[PDB]
Amino acid sequence: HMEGFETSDRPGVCDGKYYEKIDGFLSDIECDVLINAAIKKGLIKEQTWFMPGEHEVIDKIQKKTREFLNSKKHCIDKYNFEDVQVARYKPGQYYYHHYDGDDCDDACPKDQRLATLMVYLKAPEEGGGGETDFPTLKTKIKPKKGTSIFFWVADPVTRKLYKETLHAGLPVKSGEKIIANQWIRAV
C-alpha cells in the first residue's frame, strides 16, 4: 500500500483480504450482557478470560468464528481456539504497535497465532478516538458496538507473520472501549 512503486514478491494473503469487518456480529444486548459478566469477573481495576461453556455470548463468538473459518478452508485447515479474552481501554493509557504472533523466520512456533477475530463490545464516545490502527495498510477502524474485525496474523503455510497487520488500539479520548479477542492458533 505504497504510492511510490515497489516490487512485491511476498506471499499472498487469503482472498487478498488482510482484514474483514462484520457489522452486527453480536447484538447490542449481547455486548452489554458480556461486558457485565466480565465486570463480575474483575475486568475493571484490564482484562479477563473465559472458559469454553462459561458464558453463552462467548460461546456464540467461538461458534460464529468457526462458521466464518469454514468459508476459508482454501486458506486454512487445522486450527485451535484460545480462550476468549475481554479487555478494556480508557483515556491516558499506554499503547504500542505490535503483532499478535511470534515474529519468526526459520524457527516459527508450531502453535503460531494465525489470525484474530475481535469484537467491539463498547465504543468510545463522540470524538472519542480509540480507533484500531493498521499503519502499514494505512487504515483505521472506527469502533462500533457489535462489530467484528477479522484479520490475518501469520501464513498458515510457513507460520511467518504478515507484517502488514501490525496494529494498535489508539488512545481513547472520551469514554471507554471494551473488546473481545478470539485468537486462532496453528496445530
Residue 49 beta carbon to Mn ion: minimum distance, rounded to whole angstroms: 15
Coil/strand/helix, residue 41: coil
For Mn ion, the closer of residues 100 and 133 by Cβ is 100
Q: What is the distance between the alpha carbons of residues 141 and 148, in angstroms, rounded to a whole number?
A: 10
The single-letter code of the amino acid at 25 is F
- Of the pair 3, 141, the CB lying nearest Mn ion is at 141
Considering only CA atoms, which of 139, 112, 141 is closest in space to residue 129?
141
70, three cell numbers? 469454514
Residue written as grid cell 468464528: 65
Is 133 one of the binding residues for Mn ion (CB under 5 A)?
no
60 is in an annotated binding site: no
Q: How far apart are CA 52 and CA 14, in angstroms?
A: 28
Residue (100 or 131) nearer to Mn ion, CB: 100
Give the C-alpha separation, 110 to 122, whole Å.
Answer: 34
Does 100 bind Mn ion (CB under 5 A)? Our answer is yes
Q: Could you tell me how many residues of this chain bind Mn ion (CB under 5 A)? A: 1
Interface with Mn ion, residue 131, by CB under 5 A: no
Bind-site residues: 15, 74, 89, 98, 100, 132, 167, 177, 181
Bind-site residues for Mn(2+): 15, 74, 98, 100, 167
Bind-site residues for Zn(2+): 98, 100, 167
Residues in contact with Mn ion by the rule CB under 5 A:
100
